Design a protein around this ligand. Structure first.
Ligand SMILES: [Mg+2]
Ligand SMILES: [Zn+2]
Ligand SMILES: [Zn+2]
Ligand SMILES: [Zn+2]
Ligand SMILES: [Zn+2]
Lengths: 166, 56, 181, 122, 63, 97, 500, 96
DNA sequence: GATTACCGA
DNA sequence: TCGGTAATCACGCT
C-alpha cells in the first residue's frame, strides 16, 4: 500500500521506465547516474533525464563528494520520503479549488448549446453576437442545458474533503 | 482685518482668471488693458467679492 | 417600475452664467449630466425634478470656476431581476420578438413563448402554434417575467434584456381570462 | 454611487410618473433650442399613454392602504399590484411566486377583498 | 534625510537606492505632504500660497 | 518623404553644389542629399506602396548664423566614396557685448 | 479629474507578471534583415512600437501616443534577485527549517505583539525593534517544536550560499545551496509570522523574491538610436536582453536531451551572473559585463541613478520652454525694477492673452499686423483647441470677427512681468521679477544698483530670463517678486540693493 | 535647439519665495504633460484599444470604474523603471 | 585617493 | 581595541 500511488505519479511524470528506476534505486538507496544505467539496462542519458524531472517535483536530493585523486566531483543521489502525505494533500487541495469553480460558473453561465457531435454549450454573450446561429455548422441553438451533470458533480466534492481531512 | 502678502496674491490670481472666462467686469474700462491689470484696479477700490477663510 | 431618488452631488458652475440665480443656473448644469445615461448601480436616469437647497461657492487652484453642494430629485427606472413586467410587442421577427417595456426593450426567443410548438408565418407578422390556434402578433399586450439582463456600457441602446413567458398566468391578457372556463 | 451619497428613495407607479413626465414636458416652452425631449423619454411617454388605468390620487391612496393590512407587504409589493390590478387568486400566485413569503389562501383572499374596490368597472 | 519621511523624499538624496528604495518596498505606504513629492508628481506644494482657502457667494449683481 | 521644406533650395546648382559667393543664412541648405529607401515594406501607409521613393537627409547651416560661402571643395577619400567640403565666412562688426 | 492620494509599494508576484504580459519572448533577434523587421522575440511581438509602422496589438497606436507593454521570460530555473539577497539571509537564519515557525516561544510573541502599536508612528524606532527579534532567533539551535534537527549556519557574500552540515560524525562539508533548494523553504512560512519580520502578507510574500519569471521592459523605454542615416545603435538594455535569451534557449534543450550533469550546474551560474549585471552593473565581486568596444553597460540601476539619473537629471530638474540666455551690459537710465530686452528675443517669446470684452479693440490690431512688425502675434487659439498659425499667406480671414473667448499669443510689450536668473543660484534672491523694456541690440541690460543680489560683474557673464504664462502664475510674479520688495536682505537686515 | 535646464538649485529658490502657482506652471505646464487612464482597485495602468472602444485593466478585469489622472510624462516612465525590476507601484487615487 | 563611519571577530 | 568594506566629491556651456 502507498507504493503504487507513488509509481502512479511517476508514471504520469515519466512513464513505465521511471517506475523501473525508482524500484532499482530503492534497493541500493544511493546511486550515481552511471551505476543506475548498469542496474536498469537502459542508456545513462535516458536515466539521468528522469532524475532531472523528479528533481523539479521535489522527490530526490544529492550530495557532492570530493575525489582525492583526480579532483572530479561526482554526485550521489538518494530518495527522500519525509514529504509523502503533505504533497498528496496539497496537490488535491488545488484540484478541489478548481472543482469548486466549475459548478459556480455553470449556474451563472452556459444556457445554450448546439445539437451536434461537437461545438456544444455556447453562452448568451456569443449567441447574441452570433445572431443565435452557429458559425461552424449553422445549426439552430437550443436551450436549458446539462441539467443532470450540474447536480451530480456537487455530490462528488464532499467525500474528497472528508478523505483528505483524515 | 488686513490681508497678508500670500492672500493678496491669491485673491488677485483667482479674480484675474474669472475675469478672462466671462464674469462681467465692474467699472474698469479704459481703452485697453490685459486681464491681469483689470484685477489690480478692482482691488484698490475694495469691491472684491472673494473672501478668505482663516482656519483657527 | 420607476423610483424617485433624493441625492446630493457636487455641482460645477462655469463663470459664463456666473451672474444668474444659483438655483436655476445649477439646475441647467446638473440636468445636462445625468439624463439618458445608464449606470450599473441604479439604472436609467430619466429626468431631474427640482432643486431644493444649495451651498456656497469654493474656488480650487487651477480652474477658476466654483463648486457647490446641491440637493435634487431623480426619477429612475430599474429593471431588476425576477421582476414581473408588462410590455408591448412592437416588432415581429422569425427568431424572436422585441417587447417594449418602457425606455428599454426586451427580446424573447421563440421557444420560451408558450407550451406549444411555434411556427412563424413568413408571409404575415405573427406566430401560429401547432396544436392550439392561439395567435401572437403585432401590437398585442403581453405579460412576462425577466430572466436575464445584459449590462455592458453607459449607453441605454447597447444593453438588452432577456424575458420569458413559460409559466401559468403569463402571455397575452385575454389568453389568461378565456382559459378560466 | 451617484454623487456623494444616496439618502432617500421612494417607489413610483406609472400613474404617478405620468404627471412628472407632462410637467417636465411642460418646460420647453423655453423656445431657444425649442427643447425636444430625448428619444427614450419620448418612448417612455407612450408607455404611460397605454397603461394609464387609474386616477393619480386613487393609486396613491390604495398604495398607502395595502401597506397597513399586512406587515410582510411593503411598498414594492403594493406598487406591483397597481400595475397588474389582480382580480382573483391566479394573479396572487404568479406575482408572489418569487417572494420571501407565499400567502395562504385565507390571507391572500383578504388582500383581494381590499382590491375589490378601486376597480374601473368598464 | 535618512530619518523618517516619505520614501520618495529619500530617493533624490543619498543616491543609494537599492539599499534604501528596495528596503521600504516591504510593508510601506506613502501618502503625501512633502515639498519634494508634490513637485515630483504634479501637485501644489503646501507652503506659500497653497495654504489659503477661499469661499465666495453668488448673487453677484454688477451695478 | 521627410522633406525639410521648400524654397530653401534657391542656391543649388543642378548636381547639388552651391556655386560660390552666395548669402547663405538661417536654415538654408548647402548640398542636397538623397538617401536610399530604408525598409521599403514595413508601413504601407495607403499610398506608400506605389511611391517607392527615398527618405530625405541633407546638410544645412546651423540655425542661427549667416554669411557668404568662400570655396567649395570636391574630391574622393580613400575607399571609393566622395566628400565635399564647403566653407562660409562672416563679417562681424564690433557691437556691444 | 482626480488627484493622486497615495502610492503603495510591494513586490510583483509571478502570477501577476503573466496577467500583465502580452507575449512570451523566445527569439534572440531584432530585425533580420532590411525588410519585414518583424520577429517572434524581443521586438514587436505585440509588445511596443517605436517606428512609424502602425502595426501594434490590434489597437492602431502610431508611434506618437503608444504606451509600451510588458513581456515576460519563462526562466527554466529559479534565480536569486540581487537587491533582496541581503535580506533573504536575514530570513533564513531566523526561521526554523522543515516546519516554518519563527524560533520563538508564545510568551515573546504575546509580549512583542503589543510593542508594535505603542511605537506605531516613527520609522527609526520600529527599525531598531526588528533587529532584536533577529538577534534572539540567531542564538538558538534547539527549536521548541522539532527537537533540534541539526540546524546549519548560513553564509553569504555576494550571492552563493552554503551550509555547515555533518555527514559522518562531525563533518563540515559546505554543500552549496541551490535557488531551487531555497525557494522550497520560503513557501513553508505561514502568513501570520510576517509581522514579526519586516514583511507584509498581501504586498510582500518572501517566496516572490526568487525570480521564476523575469519581466521584459517595453520598447518605449528601450529606444533604437540611429547612427548616421540607416545604421541603428542598439540600446544597452536591449543588447544584454538578447544575450540573456541565448543562454536560456540551450539550457531548455540541455536538460530535455543532454545528460552530462556537469555543464548544467556550470550553465546554472552563467544565468545568475548574466541577470545580476542587468539589475545593477556596479556590484562588488562581479566583473563588469562590457560592450564589445570598451564601454561598460549602463543597466537599470545606472539608468535610475548615477548623479545624472532620473531623480535629479530628468524629474525634479527639467528643461523648460520660453527662455533665452545672452550677456549683460549696464545702463543707468532705466528705473531700479526694469530690464532691457533685445528685440530679437522679444519677437521669439510670447504670452497668451484671452480677449474678453475691453481689449478686443487692441488684439484685433495685434493679430492683423502679422509676425513681422513688432506689435504682432504668432499663434491664435480657438476655444476648441485647434490652434491656427498665422504666418502662412493670409491673416485677414483670422483678423475677422475674433469671437470673444479666443486666446491670442502676441509678443512681449512694455509692462509684462518677466523673471531673471544668474545660475549659480546661491541664495534666495537671485531670481526677481522685472518689468520689460525693449531696446534694439543683442544684450540684456540691467541697472547698476541691482548688482549685489545677482553677485555679477560685466566681464561677459550670462543671465537667463523665462516668461511666466498662465494668469494665476503671472499675477503671483508681480505682487510677490518685484525688485522693490527686496531692498533689504534676510541675512542681516541691512540694505542690499544700494549704491556702488 | 534646446533650452535651459533648472537644477535643484533653481527649484529651491522659488520655494523660498512662496510661489506655488508659478512652480507648477514652470516645471510641468511648460514641459511634457500626458493624460493617463488608471484603474481604481488594482492601482495599475489601464490599456486603451482602438478599433473596438472598450478599455479594461487586465489584472482583475473591471468594466466601468476607471478614471483619468493628470501627471507628467517623466513620472510615468518612473513607474516603468520600477516595474521592470520586480517592485509594484500601486496607485490609490483621491477625489478633489 | 581622501576622508570618515558602520560593521564584523 | 581592531580591521575591514561601500558611498560620497559646485553651476552652466562646447
Ligand atoms: Mg562674471
Ligand atoms: Zn451548432
Ligand atoms: Zn500599444
Ligand atoms: Zn520548528
Ligand atoms: Zn484593476
Amino acid at each position: 500500500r502507498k507504493n503504487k500511488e507513488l509509481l502512479e505519479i511517476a508514471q504520469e511524470i515519466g512513464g513505465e521506465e521511471a517506475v523501473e528506476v525508482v524500484k532499482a534505486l530503492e534497493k541500493m538507496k544511493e546511486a550515481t547516474d552511471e551505476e543506475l544505467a548498469e542496474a536498469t539496462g537502459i542508456r545513462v542519458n535516458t536515466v539521468r533525464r528522469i532524475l532531472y524531472m523528479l528533481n523539479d517535483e521535489g522527490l530526490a536530493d544529492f550530495k557532492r563528494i570530493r575525489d582525492p585523486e583526480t579532483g572530479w566531483y561526482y554526485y550521489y543521489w538518494r530518495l527522500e520520503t519525509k514529504k509523502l502525505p503533505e504533497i498528496i494533500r496539497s496537490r488535491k487541495m488545488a484540484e478541489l479549488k478548481k472543482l469548486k469553480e466549475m459548478l459556480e460558473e455553470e449556474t451563472s453561465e452556459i444556457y445554450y448549446w448546439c445539437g451536434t457531435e461537437g461545438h456544444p454549450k455556447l453562452t448568451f454573450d456569443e449567441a447574441m453576437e452570433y445572431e443565435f446561429q452557429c458559425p461552424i455548422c449553422g445549426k439552430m441553438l437550443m436551450q436549458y442545458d446539462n441539467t443532470h451533470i450540474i447536480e451530480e458533480l456537487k455530490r462528488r466534492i464532499e467525500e474528497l474533503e472528508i478523505e483528505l481531512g483524515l | 482685518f488686513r490681508y497678508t502678502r500670500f492672500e493678496k496674491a491669491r485673491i488677485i490670481g483667482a479674480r484675474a482668471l474669472q475675469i478672462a472666462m466671462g464674469a462681467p467686469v465692474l467699472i474698469d474700462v479704459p481703452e485697453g488693458i490685459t486681464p491681469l491689470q483689470a484685477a489690480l484696479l478692482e482691488f484698490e477700490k475694495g469691491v472684491i467679492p472673494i473672501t478668505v477663510i482663516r482656519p483657527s | 417600475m420607476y423610483k424617485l431618488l433624493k441625492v446630493k452631488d457636487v455641482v460645477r458652475i462655469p463663470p459664463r452664467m456666473f451672474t444668474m440665480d444659483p438655483k436655476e443656473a445649477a439646475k441647467i448644469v446638473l440636468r445636462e449630466t445625468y439624463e439618458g445615461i445608464y449606470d450599473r448601480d441604479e439604472g436609467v436616469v430619466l429626468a431631474i425634478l427640482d432643486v431644493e437647497e444649495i451651498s456656497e461657492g469654493v474656488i480650487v487652484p487651477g480652474d477658476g470656476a466654483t463648486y457647490h453642494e446641491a440637493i435634487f430629485n431623480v426619477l429612475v427606472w430599474e429593471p431588476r431581476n425576477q421582476e414581473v413586467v408588462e410590455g408591448e410587442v412592437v416588432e415581429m421577427m422569425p427568431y424572436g420578438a422585441f417587447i417594449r417595456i418602457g425606455p428599454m426593450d426586451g427580446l424573447v426567443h421563440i421557444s420560451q413563448l408558450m407550451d406549444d410548438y411555434v411556427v412563424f408565418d413568413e408571409k404575415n407578422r405573427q406566430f401560429i402554434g401547432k396544436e392550439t390556434n392561439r395567435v401572437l402578433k403585432l401590437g398585442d399586450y403581453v405579460r412576462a417575467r425577466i430572466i436575464g439582463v445584459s449590462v455592458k456600457s453607459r449607453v441605454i441602446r447597447e444593453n438588452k434584456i432577456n424575458m420569458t413567458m413559460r409559466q401559468p398566468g403569463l402571455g397575452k391578457f385575454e389568453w389568461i381570462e378565456k382559459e378560466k372556463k | 454611487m451617484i454623487g456623494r451619497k444616496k439618502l432617500e428613495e421612494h417607489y413610483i407607479t406609472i400613474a404617478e410618473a405620468k404627471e412628472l413626465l407632462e410637467r417636465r414636458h411642460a418646460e420647453g416652452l423655453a423656445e431657444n433650442p425649442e427643447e425636444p425631449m430625448f428619444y427614450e423619454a419620448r418612448v417612455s411617454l407612450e408607455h404611460a399613454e397605454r397603461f394609464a388605468k387609474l386616477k393619480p390620487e386613487q393609486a396613491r391612496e390604495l398604495k398607502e392602504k395595502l401597506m397597513g393590512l399586512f406587515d410582510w407587504i411593503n411598498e414594492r409589493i403594493a406598487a406591483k399590484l397597481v400595475d397588474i390590478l389582480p382580480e382573483d387568486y391566479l394573479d396572487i400566485r404568479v406575482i408572489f411566486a418569487k417572494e420571501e413569503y407565499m400567502p395562504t389562501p385565507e390571507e391572500a383572499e383578504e388582500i383581494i377583498k381590499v382590491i375589490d374596490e378601486y376597480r374601473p368597472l368598464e | 534625510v535618512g530619518e523618517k519621511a516619505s520614501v520618495l523624499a529619500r530617493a533624490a538624496f543619498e543616491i543609494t537606492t537599492q539599499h534604501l528604495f528596495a528596503a521600504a518596498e516591504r510593508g510601506e505606504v506613502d501618502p503625501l505632504n512633502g515639498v519634494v513629492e508634490n513637485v515630483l508628481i504634479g501637485q501644489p506644494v503646501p507652503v506659500g500660497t497653497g495654504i489659503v482657502k477661499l469661499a465666495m457667494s453668488l448673487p453677484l449683481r454688477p451695478k | 518623404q521627410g522633406y525639410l521644406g521648400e524654397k530653401y533650395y534657391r542656391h543649388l546648382d543642378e548636381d547639388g553644389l552651391i556655386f560660390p559667393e552666395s548669402k547663405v543664412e538661417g536654415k538654408d541648405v548647402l548640398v542636397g542629399r538623397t538617401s536610399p529607401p530604408r525598409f521599403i515594406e514595413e508601413q504601407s501607409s495607403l499610398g506608400s506602396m506605389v511611391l517607392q521613393g527615398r527618405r530625405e537627409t541633407s546638410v544645412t547651416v546651423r540655425p542661427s548664423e549667416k554669411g557668404v560661402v568662400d570655396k567649395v571643395i570636391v574630391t574622393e577619400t580613400g575607399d571609393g566614396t566622395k566628400l565635399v567640403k564647403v566653407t562660409v565666412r562672416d563679417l562681424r562688426i564690433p557691437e556691444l557685448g | 479629474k482626480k488627484v493622486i492620494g497615495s502610492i503603495e509599494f510591494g513586490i510583483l508576484s509571478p502570477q501577476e507578471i503573466r496577467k500583465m504580459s502580452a507575449a512570451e519572448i523566445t527569439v534572440p533577434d531584432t530585425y533580420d534583415d532590411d525588410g519585414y523587421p518583424i520577429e517572434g522575440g524581443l521586438m514587436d511581438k505585440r509588445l511596443g512600437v517605436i517606428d512609424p509602422g502602425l502595426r501594434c496589438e490590434t489597437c492602431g497606436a502610431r508611434a506618437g501616443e503608444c504606451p509600451g507593454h510588458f513581456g515576460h521570460i519563462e526562466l527554466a530555473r529559479p534565480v536569486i534577485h540581487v537587491g533582496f539577497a541581503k535580506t533573504i539571509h536575514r530570513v533564513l537564519e531566523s526561521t526554523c527549517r522543515e516546519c516554518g515557525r519563527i524560533k520563538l516561544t508564545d510568551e515573546e510573541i504575546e509580549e512583542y505583539m503589543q510593542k508594535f502599536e505603542v511605537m506605531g508612528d516613527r520609522k527609526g524606532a520600529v527599525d531598531k525593534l526588528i533587529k532584536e527579534i533577529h538577534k534572539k532567533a540567531k542564538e538558538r539551535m534547539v527549536c521548541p517544536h522539532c527537537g533540534a534537527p541539526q540546524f546549519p549556519i548560513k553564509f553569504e557574500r555576494p550571492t552563493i550560499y552554503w551550509e555547515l552540515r555533518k555527514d559522518e560524525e562531525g563533518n563540515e562539508y559546505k554543500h552549496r545551496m541551490m535557488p531551487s533548494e531555497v525557494r522550497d523553504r520560503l513557501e513553508k512560512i505561514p502568513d501570520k509570522d510576517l509581522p514579526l519580520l519586516g514583511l507584509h502578507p498581501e504586498k510582500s510574500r518572501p517566496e516572490w523574491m526568487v525570480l521564476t519569471v523575469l519581466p521584459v521592459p517595453p520598447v518605449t523605454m528601450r529606444p533604437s538610436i540611429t547612427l548616421e542615416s540607416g545604421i541603428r545603435a542598439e540600446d544597452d538594455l536591449t543588447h544584454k536582453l538578447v544575450d540573456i535569451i541565448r543562454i536560456n534557449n540551450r539550457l531548455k534543450s540541455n536538460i530535455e536531451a543532454g545528460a552530462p550533469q556537469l555543464i548544467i550546474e556550470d550553465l546554472w551560474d552563467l544565468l545568475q551572473y548574466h541577470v545580476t549585471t542587468y539589475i545593477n552593473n556596479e556590484t562588488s565581486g562581479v566583473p563588469p559585463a562590457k560592450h564589445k568596444s570598451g564601454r561598460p553597460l549602463k543597466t537599470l540601476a545606472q539608468r535610475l541613478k548615477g548623479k545624472e539619473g532620473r531623480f535629479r537629471g530628468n524629474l525634479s530638474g527639467k528643461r523648460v520652454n520660453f527662455s533665452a540666455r545672452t550677456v549683460i551690459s549696464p545702463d543707468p537710465m532705466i528705473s531700479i525694477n526694469e530690464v532691457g530686452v533685445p528685440l530679437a528675443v522679444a519677437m521669439e517669446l510670447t504670452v497668451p492673452e484671452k480677449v474678453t470684452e475691453f481689449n478686443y479693440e487692441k488684439l484685433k490690431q495685434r493679430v492683423l499686423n502679422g509676425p513681422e512688425k513688432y506689435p504682432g502675434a504668432n499663434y491664435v487659439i480657438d476655444p476648441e483647441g485647434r490652434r491656427i498659425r498665422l504666418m502662412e499667406s493670409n491673416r485677414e480671414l483670422i483678423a475677422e470677427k475674433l469671437d470673444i473667448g479666443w486666446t491670442v499669443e502676441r509678443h512681449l510689450e512694455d509692462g509684462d512681468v518677466v523673471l531673471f536668473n544668474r545660475q549659480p543660484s546661491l541664495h534666495r534672491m537671485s531670481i526677481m521679477a522685472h518689468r520689460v523694456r525693449v531696446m534694439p541690440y543683442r544684450t540684456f541690460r540691467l541697472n547698476l544698483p541691482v548688482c549685489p543680489p545677482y553677485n555679477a560683474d560685466f566681464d561677459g557673464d550670462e543671465m537667463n530670463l523665462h516668461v511666466p504664462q498662465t494668469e494665476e502664475a503671472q499675477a503671483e510674479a508681480k505682487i510677490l517678486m518685484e525688485v522693490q520688495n527686496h531692498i533689504i536682505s534676510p541675512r542681516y537686515g541691512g540694505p542690499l540693493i544700494a549704491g556702488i | 535647439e534646446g533650452g535651459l535646464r533648472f537644477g535643484e538649485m533653481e527649484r529651491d529658490v522659488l520655494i523660498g519665495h512662496g510661489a506655488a502657482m508659478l512652480l507648477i506652471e514652470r516645471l510641468l505646464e511648460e514641459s511634457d504633460k500626458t493624460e493617463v487612464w488608471v484603474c481604481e482597485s488594482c492601482g495599475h495602468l489601464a490599456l486603451e484599444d482602438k478599433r473596438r472602444g472598450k478599455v479594461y485593466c487586465p489584472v482583475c478585469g473591471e468594466d466601468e470604474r476607471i478614471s483619468k489622472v493628470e501627471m507628467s510624462y517623466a513620472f510615468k516612465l518612473l513607474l516603468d523603471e520600477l516595474k521592470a525590476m520586480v517592485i509594484r507601484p500601486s496607485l490609490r487615487l483621491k477625489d478633489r
